[PDB]
Amino acid sequence: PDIFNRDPRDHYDLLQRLGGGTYGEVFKARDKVSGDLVALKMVKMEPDDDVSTLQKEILILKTCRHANIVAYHGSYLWLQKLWICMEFCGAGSLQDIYQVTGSLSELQISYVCREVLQGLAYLHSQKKIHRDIKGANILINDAGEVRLADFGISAQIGAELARRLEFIGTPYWMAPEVAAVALKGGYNELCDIWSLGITAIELAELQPPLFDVHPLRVLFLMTKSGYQPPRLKEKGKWSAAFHNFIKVTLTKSPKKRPSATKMLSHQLVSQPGLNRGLILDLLDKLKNGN
């Protein structure tokens, strides 16, 4: 896959850290030669991470042509630190945008959901799971394309699972079923479908349900037997299709939750009038206001 064995700072200059920690170590950078702006993500490499596996995963990312996946431009290995070069989105995430433009329109939310579903179906078709669908992780590039970042690499999943070990504690005494559950963490492809439903509410109300309750209490609320899937709080403001999209995506039982493929036949994401223009208006509103 031709992963560079060079210090990426040999070719780029870091300008700005992105995400405030929510993205990890991700930087806005400038191609020294061409001056092009890119995003460099640094995935710390453990000695255990087999570079043979890395090469296979990077090849998959390099050959990706899906319009809803963040563009891969190359990668670097230097001092056991893997760097991935991708497109830089001046607009950033949808969270960066609606924090300025405000509530997104139903059609705009519909376009976003359709595009994210298309991307989710591509990831799921590779037996990948995103696990963190949310406004902060859906990116709008300068051309108005909705894209998800594909970080399906063992070194990244290993880092996430490294925090999961600090969460569950020491494993030496754990039963196999406890270790298996803790490892998977309940994450399954259809969990991205639920997360998208929540995101649609986030884009519609500028925050997810129960955001006014501190996390610990929400975890106990979510896991009550009678926990009910959230809904939009302003009925009249939205069509029956939007409400139904939420109802269907936010199915409590994973077995009965529809896949990304099936969801693409839903009225809200199949309706006429969904075109890139909707995002170009949003970008205009962000750059120039009212």
Ligand X SMILES: Cc1c(-c2cc3cc(NC(=O)O[C@H]4COC[C@@H]4C)ncc3c(N)c2F)cnc2c1NCCO2
User: Which segments are annotated as binding site?
Assistant: 18-26, 41
Counting contacts by CB under 8 A, is residue 119 touching a second copy?
A: no
Nearer to ligand X, 132 or 281 (CB): 132
Q: Cα-atom radius of gyration of the chain, to the nearest Å?
A: 20
Binding mask 208-227 for a second copy (x = CB under 8 A): xxxx--xxxxxxx-xx---x
Minimum CB separation of residue 4 from a second copy in Å reads: 26
Nearer to a second copy, 120 or 198 (CB): 198
Counting contacts by CB under 8 A, is residue 256 touching a second copy?
A: no
Distance between CA atoms of residues 166 and 1, nearest Å: 34
Nearer to Na ion, 56 or 233 (CB): 233
Nearer to ligand X, 99 or 207 (CB): 99
> What is the size of the binding site for Na ion (CB under 5 A)?
2
**132 has catalytic annotation:** yes
Find the catalytic residue in 31, 36, 96, 132. 132
- C-alpha of 59 from chain center: 21
Answer for which of 8, 27, 41, 191 binds ligand X (CB under 6 A) is 41
**Strand 81-87 and strand 138-140: pairing?**
unpaired
Minimum CB separation of residue 168 from a second copy in Å reads: 5
Distance between CA atoms of residues 182 and 163, nearest Å: 11
Residue 3, helix vs strand vs coil: coil
Chain residue whose CB lies nearest ligand X: 92
Largest CA distance in the chain: 60
- Take residue 220 and report the two structure tokens written for it: 């106990």
Binding mask 145-164 for ligand X (x = CB under 6 A): ----x-x-------------
> What is the size of the binding site for ligand X (CB under 6 A)?
21
> How many residues are recorded in the chain?
290
Nearer to a second copy, 184 or 237 (CB): 184
Counting contacts by CB under 8 A, is residue 199 touching a second copy?
A: yes
Q: Exposed (0-12), middle (13-18) or buried (19+): which is 44, by Cβ within 10 Å?
A: middle
Counting contacts by CB under 6 A, is residue 61 touching ligand X?
A: no
The closest of 95, 98, 91, 67 to 140, measured between CA atoms, is: 91
Answer for which of 176, 236, 273, 289 binds a second copy (CB under 8 A) is 176
Minimum CB separation of residue 39 from ligand X in Å reads: 4
Distance between CA atoms of residues 137 and 260, nearest Å: 18
Q: What angle do CA 235, 232, 195 make, to 5 degrees?
A: 155
- Take residue 184 and report the two structure tokens written for it: 């998977």
CB burial readout 84-120, b (16+ within 10 A) else e: bbbbbbebbbbbbbbeebeebebbbbbbbbbbbbbbb
Answer for which of 17, 233, 262, 276 binds Na ion (CB under 5 A) is 233
Q: Where are the beta strands (DSSP E) in 101-244?
A: 138-140, 146-148
Minimum CB separation of residue 37 from a second copy in Å reads: 29
Q: Where are the beta strands (DSSP E) in 18-79?
A: 25-31, 37-44, 72-77
Binding residues (CB under 5 A) for Na ion: these are 209, 233
The residues binding a second copy (CB under 8 A) are 46, 48, 132-134, 158, 161-188, 190-191, 194-195, 198-199, 202, 208-211, 214-220, 222-223, 227, 252, 254, 257
For the annotated catalytic residues, the residue numbers are 132
